[PDB]
Amino acid sequence: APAAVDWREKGAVTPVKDQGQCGSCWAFSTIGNIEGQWQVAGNPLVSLSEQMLVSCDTIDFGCGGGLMDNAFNWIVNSNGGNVFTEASYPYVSGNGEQPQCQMNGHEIGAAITDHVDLPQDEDAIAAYLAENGPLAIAVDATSFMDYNGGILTSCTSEQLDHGVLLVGYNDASNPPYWIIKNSWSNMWGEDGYIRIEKGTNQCLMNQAVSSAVVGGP
Numbered sequence: 001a002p003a004a005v006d007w008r009e010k011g012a013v014t015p016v017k018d019q020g021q022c023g024s025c026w027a028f029s030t031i032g033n034i035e036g037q038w039q040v041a042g043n044p045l046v047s048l049s050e051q052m053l054v055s056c057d058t059i060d061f062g063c064g065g066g067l068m069d070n071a072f073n074w075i076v077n078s079n080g081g082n083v084f085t086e087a088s089y090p091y092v093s094g095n096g097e098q099p100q101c102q103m104n105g106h107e108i109g110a111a112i113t114d115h116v117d118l119p120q121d122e123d124a125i126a127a128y129l130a131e132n133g134p135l136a137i138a139v140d141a142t143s144f145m146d147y148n149g150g151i152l153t154s155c156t157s158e159q160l161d162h163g164v165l166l167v168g169y170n171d172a173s174n175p176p177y178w179i180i181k182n183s184w185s186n187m188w189g190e191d192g193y194i195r196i197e198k199g200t201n202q203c204l205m206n207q208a209v210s211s212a213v214v215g216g217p
């Protein structure tokens, strides 16, 4: 793969968002991956709706949690592949309240046809990332809680518990690192991002990487 990839420079990544007091990381990760894959496939960047998943995805558990693979499946099998825009279906669950599913009054911003699960291999993940755009991943976020900047090199890596968005990497750094977009506002980390070392499976980053497919069979 290339020595470095940063999908934020290419217009494939929306501004950092804030899940607030709701366990909706899984929906932020899903949506950020779709926003990325849609733009990289040749469409103008559009912000898409986490609220749609929180409120409408019957496989997952709203603010009680979920899985990106389940959200991808819901979008395709229950919503015809379609994803509403953020502007037309705004995120209101930051206070932890969960309105009922509203299917009316929205605009469709993107469509997906399937999803894929990547192998547990940092080089496969880098290549897929470099070709296709930002990826949904899960991490052990124990080390995220006290992060204030820099490259994490001894991240606790015991149990997955948080969904995030993998947006790039830089191999020409000592040490090499991955670039991850979090959903804890731009007041957390490096304006909402974190860097973790690449090549050492930091935070178990390789364990559950997935992506939507745009314009597939």
Ligand SMILES: N#CC1(NC(=O)[C@@H]2Cc3ccc(c(Cl)c3)OCCCCOc3cc(C(F)(F)F)ccc3C(=O)N2)CC1
Binding pocket: 022, 023, 024, 025, 026, 059, 060, 061, 063, 064, 065, 066, 067, 068, 070, 137, 138, 139, 160, 161, 162, 163, 208
């Ligand atoms: N933000 C947030 C919260 N955490 C999560 O959403 C994590 C976010 C999360 C955590 C771990 C992850 C993934 Cl892919 C996401 O990879 C390991 C998955 C273990 C199974 O975790 C879940 C399974 C389900 C279920 F299968 F029942 F649908 C639902 C939720 C999780 C889960 O623990 N999701 C506090 C709810």
